Design a binder for this molecule. Structure first.
Ligand SMILES: [Cl-]
Ligand SMILES: [Zn+2]
Ligand SMILES: [Zn+2]
Ligand SMILES: [Zn+2]
Ligand SMILES: [Zn+2]
Length: 149
């Protein structure tokens, strides 16, 4: 019995499996071939994220089925703030946070009063009271901090 895995490079690997092989077992096989650890794997079949403890047969995964591998990451929503002198601050934020909130977080880390902070995103200077969501600031976006002293 063989199934196919569409890997993270774009390629497709073949795995020799058995109907009762768990998803956990499949993740091990992938880690052997692609060298990515099971904790990092999310396996998608026919629109369904697959569960570690269940078997191929529980999911009716038949010969020649194609599993899609997706990278799995873990961490609170973060953004970066670059300084005049190239230090990068990492911040834990939420989509609803206002720029006011973000300035309070900068004061927390670096001790700069909010009223001395100017924050820029995609060349655009941000206004407090508007949220990160309004500006389309996503996880791992980068803000630039400028100071009115
Ligand atoms: Cl086997
Ligand atoms: Zn066996
Ligand atoms: Zn917040
Ligand atoms: Zn302000
Ligand atoms: Zn990322």
């Amino acid at each position: 019995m063989q199934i196919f895995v569409k890997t993270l490079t774009g390629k497709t690997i073949t795995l020799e499996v058995e109907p009762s092989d768990t998803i956990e077992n499949v993740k091990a096989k992938i880690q052997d071939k692609e060298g990515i650890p099971p904790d990092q794997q999310r396996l998608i079949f026919a629109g369904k994220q697959l569960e570690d403890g269940r078997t191929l047969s529980d999911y009716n995964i038949q010969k020649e089925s194609t599993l899609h591998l997706v990278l799995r990451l873990r961490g609170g929503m973060q953004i970066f703030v670059k300084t005049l002198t190239g230090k990068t601050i990492t911040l834990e934020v939420e989509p609803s946070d206002t720029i006011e909130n973000v300035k309070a977080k900068i004061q927390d880390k670096e001790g700069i009063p909010p009223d001395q902070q100017r924050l820029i995103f995609a060349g655009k200077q941000l206004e407090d009271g508007r949220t990160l969501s309004d500006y389309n600031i996503q996880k791992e976006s980068t803000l630039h901090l400028v100071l009115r002293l």
